[PDB]
Design an enzyme around this catalytic site. Structure first.
Site, PDB file in Angstrom:
ATOM      1  N   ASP A  39       2.691  16.672   0.175  1.00 56.52           N
ATOM      2  CA  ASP A  39       3.865  16.048  -0.445  1.00 56.52           C
ATOM      3  C   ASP A  39       4.648  16.916  -1.416  1.00 56.52           C
ATOM      4  OD1 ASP A  39       4.967  13.506  -1.907  1.00 56.52           O
ATOM      5  OD2 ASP A  39       3.654  12.477  -0.519  1.00 56.52           O
ATOM      6  N   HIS A  69       6.350  11.606  -6.627  1.00 58.95           N
ATOM      7  CA  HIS A  69       5.910  10.978  -5.378  1.00 58.95           C
ATOM      8  C   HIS A  69       4.507  11.392  -4.942  1.00 58.95           C
ATOM      9  CE1 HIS A  69       6.117  10.309  -0.826  1.00 58.95           C
ATOM     10  NE2 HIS A  69       6.704   9.194  -1.220  1.00 58.95           N
ATOM     11  N   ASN A 161      10.483   3.909   6.584  1.00 60.33           N
ATOM     12  CA  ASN A 161      11.113   2.807   5.901  1.00 60.33           C
ATOM     13  C   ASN A 161      12.480   2.417   6.398  1.00 60.33           C
ATOM     14  OD1 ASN A 161       8.737   2.855   4.087  1.00 60.33           O
ATOM     15  ND2 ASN A 161       9.698   4.376   2.832  1.00 60.33           N
ATOM     16  N   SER A 224       4.977   4.960   2.520  1.00 58.85           N
ATOM     17  CA  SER A 224       4.504   6.090   1.786  1.00 58.85           C
ATOM     18  C   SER A 224       3.370   5.642   0.833  1.00 58.85           C
ATOM     19  CB  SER A 224       5.582   6.667   0.865  1.00 58.85           C
ATOM     20  OG  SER A 224       6.239   7.795   1.427  1.00 58.85           O
TER      21      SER A 224
END
Ligand SMILES: [Ca+2]
Ligand SMILES: [Ca+2]
Length: 279
Positions: A39, A69, A161, A224
């Protein structure tokens, strides 16, 4: 073991019904296994990690998480308070920048990196790779995901998403890896969650409390946030010796809570990640 007043997603995963608040898990808690979080990086110094997290590779100027994140995802995998596998080893691969964006070529390189790098690490119970990222269909991105999976790493990827069929999204559409959809606290499919036949399982993804940069915490939503719940669950099951990297996804789907989710479109699995813990 039991974690009283746990974040809803943790309680959900060790429960047959929604609405509980204790997270029940085996005390082994994923020790011996390793989870690579691919990430924006991980804030390894965060006290919730207890010295169990470490940056191993960056593709940018620095290896620090200037976004948050990746630190969030890593927390769900194995932070003390917000994590599924509380004693697992976390390794950060920074393929996303501080704006949370990265290119396909750098994401592919990060995946090849982990496939090779796991051979210099001591992970007796197994290796997991968590990928809470994705974009439009790409056969090279899918292919990098499949090579990682075949190298002996349990690969878990976000469904996406866009409230759309995950088949047009990558790493998501790679049928050999574990594609994770998101659910909310009422057992409804998260409204933003992608769906479709490529999905393998659903995990808690709406309003997930976890670690954040600057030594803080924050609640956020997305497929996520669902991805790390199943990467963390795989690490816990592998250290328990119930499954292996090659069949962990299928073992999770086989033992999930079935038929509990609402708003699951015809053709999408109705399977919710479940640890099957009995004291
Ligand atoms: Ca039920
Ligand atoms: Ca699959």
């Amino acid at each position: 073991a039991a974690q009283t007043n746990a974040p809803w997603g943790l309680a959900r995963i060790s429960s047959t019904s929604p609405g509980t608040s204790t997270y029940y898990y085996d005390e082994s808690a994923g020790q011996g296994s390793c989870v690579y979080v691919i990430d924006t990086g991980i804030e390894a110094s965060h006290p919730e990690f207890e010295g169990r997290a470490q940056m191993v590779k960056t593709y940018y100027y620095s290896s620090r998480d200037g976004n948050g994140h990746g630190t969030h995802c890593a927390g769900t995998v194995g932070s003390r308070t917000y994590g599924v596998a509380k004693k697992t080893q976390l390794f950060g691969v920074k393929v996303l920048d501080d704006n949370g964006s990265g290119q396909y070529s750098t994401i592919i390189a990060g995946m090849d990196f982990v496939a090779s790098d796991k051979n210099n690490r001591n992970c007796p119970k197994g290796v997991v790779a968590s990928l809470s990222l994705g974009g439009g269909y790409s056969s090279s991105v899918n292919s990098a995901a499949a090579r990682l999976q075949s190298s002996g790493v349990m690969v878990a990827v976000a469904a996406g998403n866009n409230n759309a069929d995950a088949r047009n999204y990558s790493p998501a559409s790679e049928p050999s890896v574990c594609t994770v959809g998101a659910s909310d606290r009422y057992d409804r499919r998260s409204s933003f969650s992608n769906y479709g036949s490529v999905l393998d399982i659903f995990g808690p993804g709406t309003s997930i409390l976890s670690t954040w940069i600057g030594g803080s915490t924050r609640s956020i939503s997305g497929t996520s946030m669902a991805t790390p719940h199943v990467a963390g669950l795989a690490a816990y099951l592998m250290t328990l010796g119930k499954t292996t990297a090659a069949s962990a996804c299928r073992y999770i789907a086989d033992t999930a809570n079935k038929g509990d989710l609402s708003n699951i479109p015809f053709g999408t699995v109705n399977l919710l990640a479940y640890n099957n813990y009995q004291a």
